Design a protein around this ligand. Structure first.
Ligand code: HEC
Length: 108
């Protein structure tokens, strides 16, 4: 791809410190500020039920792949103009590789 496997352990911790404040990953976990991310790969954006996404996330109709996800983690607002995900971005590809490495793992 344009994405290469990284550290699943490294990623778990990137997640704990940069994504847990607003999200859960497990099947049957709850929606918090952001949606629960279980099964997000291959899924399109704005489809978890019981969660109020913005008009923008929804209309972007993004098919979430390790690659797509990469772009998005760089600069969310950049990738999805008007999204309410208040996250700066992960500029370091290595960081993204790690994080996505875990998400790929944890969200199945
Ligand atoms: C709270 C300050 C958040 C942090 C930190 C992170 N995200 Fe988030 N995320 C949040 C919201 C409010 C939303 C919904 C946006 C909208 O416009 O409705 C999101 C959304 C996502 C998505 C898209 C979900 C989908 O289409 O189903 C992804 C893929 C996602 N968030 C991932 C993610 C990761 C991996 C994060 C850590 C680096 C992270 N987010 C931070 C809120 C917050």
């Amino acid at each position: 791809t344009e994405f290469k496997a990284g550290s699943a352990k490294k990623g778990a911790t990137l997640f704990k410190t940069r994504c847990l404040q607003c999200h859960t990953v497990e099947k049957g976990g709850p929606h918090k500020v952001g949606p629960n991310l279980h099964g997000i790969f291959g899924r399109h954006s704005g489809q978890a039920e019981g969660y109020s996404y913005t008009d923008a996330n929804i209309k972007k109709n993004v098919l979430w792949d390790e690659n797509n996800m990469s772009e998005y983690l760089t600069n969310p607002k950049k990738y999805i103009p008007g999204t309410k995900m208040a996250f700066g971005g992960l500029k370091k590809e290595k960081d993204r590789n790690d994080s996505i490495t875990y998400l790929k793992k944890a969200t199945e």
